[PDB]
Ligand binder design. Structure first.
Ligand SMILES: [Ca+2]
Ligand code: NA
Lengths: 281, 63
């Protein structure tokens, strides 16, 4: 039997599924360590690797990209977990090697591949403390081209009054996602700052792991794909909505939690986001 | 102890020794400063970001 991880229910994705919307025909690039395409609870539609020494994007030697991919799009069937957008067209854009790191140029090359291949949504469960002009230009280009770009806020916790949101999350063109648990409490590690946009579940998140496994991971990396998957559900119900509109729908319909420095606009609610009229609950 | 600001500017070797005294089961991974990394949180891990001289270039922290 299939299990629905709590975070998929928490963001109200089953309300979209019951309406008949599951992300069909929406192209989501998981820009990450690869995706294990042999996993029976994933269907990978395509991809490319920007990692010079790891040329196969369908081999995930780390595990992280496979876990992120399952939160976006684990298949709706009788096994494993259920993804937020289980019919999405999932693309493995490998820019991180086995050790979980990549060079800025590899990340930018993956964003450029996503733009050239007409991705609707990019998920970046990754970050670093410094930006670069070239990284900012790649994300701004993807957004100018119509792509919804979602990233983890980072796991740098608090530092007095300073922002600790990393890049590319910290760029205004990117939706930076922090992590809450099942009680809607901010995870102690979740980055903070005025660039924090929305929150999603990022504690003890069950998803797919390589070699036909499943397991619970923690991080803003886990929160980000709930929002990327929610964007794919919204686009499957409203295929002409722009990325501007998808982003605003998610921002404008959160459940407000605490102070925005710690919680941004609150927890996403994809049921409310996918209505025509938007307000907070 | 979950952060080691006193290690910035030290060699990677000293940093490893010190972190393993405080957290002997730590999974230490050495990465180049200025890379982008996965944003998962691993309580057992300490990433050490080094400059091109193999000195610590960012405050080591658990995660
Ligand atoms: Ca399934
Ligand atoms: Na941002």
């Amino acid at each position: 039997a299939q299990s629905v991880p709590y975070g998929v229910s928490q963001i109200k994705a089953p309300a979209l599924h019951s309406q008949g919307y599951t992300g069909s025909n929406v192209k989501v690039a998981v820009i990450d360590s690869g995706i294990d395409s042999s996993h029976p609870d994933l269907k990978v539609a395509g991809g490319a690797s920007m990692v010079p020494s790891e040329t196969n994007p369908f081999q995930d030697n780390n595990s992280h990209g496979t876990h992120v991919a399952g939160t976006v799009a684990a298949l709706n069937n009788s096994i494993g977990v259920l993804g937020v957008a289980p019919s999405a067209s999932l693309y493995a854009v490998k820019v991180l090697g086995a050790d979980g790191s990549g060079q800025y140029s590899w990340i930018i090359n993956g964003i450029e591949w996503a733009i050239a291949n007409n991705m609707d949504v990019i998920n970046m469960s990754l970050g670093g403390p410094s930006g670069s002009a070239a990284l900012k230009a790649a994300v701004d280009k993807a957004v100018a081209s119509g792509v919804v770009v979602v990233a983890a806020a980072g796991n740098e916790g608090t530092s007095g009054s300073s922002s600790t949101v990393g890049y590319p999350g910290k760029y205004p063109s990117v939706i930076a996602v922090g992590a809450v648990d099942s009680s809607n409490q901010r995870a102690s590690f979740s980055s903070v700052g005025p660039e924090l946009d929305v929150m999603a579940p990022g504690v003890s998140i069950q998803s797919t792991l390589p070699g036909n496994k499943y397991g619970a991971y923690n991080g803003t990396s886990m929160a980000s794909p709930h929002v990327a998957g929610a964007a794919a559900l919204i686009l499957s119900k409203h295929p002409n909505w722009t990325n501007t509109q998808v982003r605003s729908s998610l921002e404008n319909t959160t459940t407000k939690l605490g102070d925005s420095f710690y919680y941004g606009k609150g927890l996403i609610n994809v049921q409310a986001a996918a209505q025509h009229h938007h307000h907070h609950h | 102890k979950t952060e080691w600001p006193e290690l910035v500017g030290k060699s990677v070797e000293e940093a490893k020794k010190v972190i393993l005294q405080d957290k002997p089961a730590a999974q230490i991974i050495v990465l180049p400063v200025g890379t982008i990394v996965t944003a998962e949180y691993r309580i057992d891990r300490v990433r050490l970001f080094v400059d091109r001289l193999d000195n610590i270039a960012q405050v080591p922290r658990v995660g």
